[PDB]
Amino acid sequence: MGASKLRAVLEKLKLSRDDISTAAGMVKGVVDHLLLRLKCDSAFRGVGLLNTGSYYEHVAPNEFDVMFKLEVPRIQLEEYSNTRAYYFVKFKRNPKENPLSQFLEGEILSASKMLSKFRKIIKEEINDIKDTDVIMKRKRGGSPAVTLLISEKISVDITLALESKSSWPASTQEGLRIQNWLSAKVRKQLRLKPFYLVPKHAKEGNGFQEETWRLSFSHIEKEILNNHGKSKTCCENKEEKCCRKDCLKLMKYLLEQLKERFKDKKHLDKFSSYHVKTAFFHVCTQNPQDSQWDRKDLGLCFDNCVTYFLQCLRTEKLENYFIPEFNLFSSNLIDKRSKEFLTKQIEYERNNEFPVFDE
Ligand SMILES: Nc1nc(=O)c2ncn([C@@H]3O[C@H](CO)[C@@H](O)[C@H]3OP(=O)(O)OC[C@H]3O[C@@H](n4cnc5c(N)ncnc54)[C@H](O)[C@@H]3OP(=O)(O)O)c2[nH]1
């Protein structure tokens, strides 16, 4: 695949400043309103907007992703069934009145109740109280996000998150292997930042827990993504222009297009851009030098990514970049047939100069 061809695709994928500014304006308004009103509850009084950038998320330009962080003080986690990613939330001391005490189902903080209250407050307040027309989508299966549709054209996913300024869980110890890439110093200062928790329940055979939370490091992902090169001046000049972000955009667009084409079937529904992002991070670990990401070698680099991703589909092994023992492509999460299907489609695309980019 020619580099100029891929860069022609990415060239034709760039959206105008107006289309971004308008939607960003509407979403900004709705988000500010929802936040200001969310602060009317004692539980969500300390709510706050988490800066994930709200951009570089969809390649779908009408889809946004905002995260509502909620500050919780000195929480104690309990790893559930050694899933390494899902935990129970407890509080060290509750003699002092706790805003979230209403959601306590014993000593364990109920995620489903918090999500229910959250979604209910939002559902009540979105009823045209603003000047914008907003509606709430149907409750998704096992999704922590509350999605809203604005003007029947804009999609906004709102995910509640508990912020813990404590040290990261032991399951993340062997994760974030960015030492040879972004230096151990940067890894150090990154792990000093807080970590988040989203209301995501874990699978227990033929049942669900609805009381567990999952680890989230979206802020860390944004940080390492926007500061990606080994050299501090990476992509700040003509001599040090790389193609990392370009590769990620291309991969995301590939998966997006394949999911779209095969929307009628349910094969590619379980695959998400996070699998792509994770694979990209692992390739970034494998190729730490900026010289391995030269722009003229785009077509090469991208291929590499593709190959690796396919491997992950073939071997059914995609470790979480922060939680190495958490496999995203386990047979328990995604069935073999779906990954074989996706493998087939991606292989077809790669072998035929990617006709799925032609749209
Ligand atoms: N908004 C949202 N936040 C979540 O944390 C989340 N977890 C699951 N789901 C949804 O549940 C269904 C089945 O599980 C899927 O439909 C899936 O939707 P999705 O298309 O995946 O959502 C894309 C974003 O959701 C995030 N991400 C998705 N998976 C994970 C994960 N395992 N760990 C941490 N974050 C994850 C990720 O940031 C990625 O970024 P982009 O917006 O750029 O695509 C989530 N949806």
Ligand SMILES: [Zn+2]
């Ligand atoms: Zn760069």
